[PDB]
Amino acid sequence: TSLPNYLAGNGDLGSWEPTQIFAGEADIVTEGGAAGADIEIYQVIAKNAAGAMVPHDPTATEVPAPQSVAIGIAAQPAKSGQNVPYYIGGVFNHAALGWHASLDTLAKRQAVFDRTNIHIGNLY
Amino acid sequence: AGLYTTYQLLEVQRKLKTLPAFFLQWFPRQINFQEDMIAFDKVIQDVTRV
Amino acid sequence: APFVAPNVQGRVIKESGYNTKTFKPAYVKPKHVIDPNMIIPRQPGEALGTG
User: Fold this and answer.
1) Checking phi first, is residue C41 left (phi over 0); if not, alpha (psi -120 to 50) or beta?
2) Containing domain of residue A99, as a range?
3) A87: domain CATH number?
4) A-contacting residues of B 1-30, CB under 8 Å?
């Protein structure tokens, strides 16, 4: 911060690429709800036993735990104890979301949302 | 945003400290002498003697 | 100011810098719905019997 740089050289001012999210024309439905853990931006959320917004994870206990169903795509980041507004409707991008491991291909990501208002489709 | 967050600048907040004159108020007389030193002469004449 | 003997050269004083603050506003959206369940019943400033 203190000193200047006297020598000759180059550098990047920066680089930028847009982030597109919507893939279609379904209506957009949102509700806030109390979070339960750390939540990124556009990470798929679930609901735990207590009713908090745990970010989504399959392979959860025996019995399929209620974390296994996935409900909403988060919209703005928050912490455990900060309630989160999330999308409950619409048609969203396939790649701009925040997934996790073992859920890689196109087919499994739509098999997450085979039923709801939320639909997951590719861009072009 | 994009490459960098845009801004508007508002005015600079300049706190300026001073140290005003309180003990110089009893030192009013100025001497600008080119010699070396300043000499004084104090004389006490005690008179109150029986 | 530093006391320097009149032969020697003198001391050198350092300087200071400055800081910044950036802020960003919040955003607000209240709304309503107007179904026929709220238009049809009687407002109080209206006579009895007929409307």
Assistant:
1) beta
2) 29-121
3) 2.40.300.10
4) 2-4
